[PDB]
């Protein structure tokens, strides 16, 4: 009846086992399970993610052991929070992380167990640092083809997620499926130390530790002189003369600005004499 676009709140702790357990299955595809709480129709949260045994014979719906979860939920009771299960996830490192033929067969089984059972995919390969990558989807019922086939209200959270549209075969699965919005509920307490732990460990280890003399400048002078004539022949090549040769051509970069910063490296590193000492 009434269906509203869902918003997925992921915890920074749940983001860990998505890429981490997925990295352990690389190259092969894994099968996980999502753990969280259903607040309402238009929003959903995943508060935890745990690792499930990887299948070396290929992913199947029987790869999830029911006594593995029954022993896990009991261990979650003695753990701080015993929250009910919600849905499943699987890695797909070998390709662009789209729902395979097994993923649709385990859909109607998991959506019978739990109401939503959001399908979540993840890939390591698409980037390293500055991209969300991952993936998510939710099955829209094929029996609804008799009814209105274009959910959801509050559109562009889908529509904008429908950008880039990610080639063809991916959105070729937009038949019988619709993706879901992933935003981050603020962990910033942990996220503030995530930046502090990362940059401090990357700043000279104490900031002190790190803080071929003339010879490095004799090797640099070959880049600061012998590179000049191959750079300064181009203005004489800009002289035609004049003018039979196709123009414009700009040879100014990148050596000029590199030798600039090359002195910026050597000047402030030589200031270590004046800085460290006295």
């Amino acid at each position: 009846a009434v269906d509203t676009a869902e918003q997925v709140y992921i915890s920074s702790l749940a983001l860990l086992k998505m890429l981490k357990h997925g990295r352990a299955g690389v190259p092969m595809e894994v099968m996980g399970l999502m753990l969280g709480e259903f607040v309402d129709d238009y929003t959903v949260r995943v508060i935890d993610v745990f690792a499930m045994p990887q299948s070396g014979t290929g992913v199947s719906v029987e790869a999830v052991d029911p006594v593995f979860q029954a022993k896990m939920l009991d261990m979650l009771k003695q753990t701080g929070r015993p929250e009910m299960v919600v849905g499943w996830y699987h890695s797909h490192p070998g390709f662009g992380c789209w729902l395979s033929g097994v993923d649709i067969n385990t859909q109607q089984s998991f959506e019978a167990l739990s109401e939503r059972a959001v399908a979540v995919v993840v890939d390591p390969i698409q980037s390293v640092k500055g991209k969300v990558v991952i993936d998510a989807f939710r099955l829209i019922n094929a029996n609804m083809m008799v009814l209105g086939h274009e959910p959801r209200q509050t559109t562009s959270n889908l529509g904008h997620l429908n950008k880039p549209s990610i080639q063809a075969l991916i959105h070729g699965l937009n038949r019988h499926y619709y993706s879901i919005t992933i935003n981050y509920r603020k962990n910033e307490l942990e996220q503030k130390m995530l930046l502090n732990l990362h940059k401090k460990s990357w700043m000279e280890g104490l900031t002190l530790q790190d803080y071929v003399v003339k010879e490095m400048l004799e090797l640099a002078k070959n880049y600061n002189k012998a590179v000049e004539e191959e750079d300064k022949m181009t203005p004489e090549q800009l002289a035609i003369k004049n003018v039979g040769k196709q123009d414009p051509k700009r040879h100014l970069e990148e050596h000029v600005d590199v030798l600039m910063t090359s002195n910026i490296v050597q000047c402030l590193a030589a200031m270590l004499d004046t800085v460290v000492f006295k």
Binding site: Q153, T154, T155, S156, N157, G159, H160
Partner: protein, 95 residues
């Protein structure tokens, strides 16, 4: 701005709908009959010259640019005591 978070926010655009007009009513409940000239063509009045005819309070439309070109009627029994420059309801004195 963003109704894509919640669709009622698109139906909350209903707040942008507000009435505005100008009125030539003289005073109280009595409705005077006054017609004065306007130098703008009906092309502005079309909703897909020598002189125009404006109410005579129901009032008649005017564009903010047409307020300067209109002149109070000198032959009418009802003439405004206040100089007519911009729109809005203004007083109209009976001679």
């Amino acid at each position: 701005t963003q109704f894509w978070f919640w669709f009622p926010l698109s139906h909350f655009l209903s707040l942008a709908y507000t009435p505005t007009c100008v009125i030539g009513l003289n005073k109280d409940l009595k409705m005077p009959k006054v017609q004065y000239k306007s130098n703008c063509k009906p092309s502005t009045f079309a909703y897909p010259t020598a002189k125009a005819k404006k109410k005579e309070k129901n009032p008649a439309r005017v564009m903010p640019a047409q307020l300067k070109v209109l002149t109070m009627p000198e032959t009418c029994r009802y003439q405004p005591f206040k100089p007519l420059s911009i729109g809005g309801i203004i007083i109209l004195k009976d001679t």
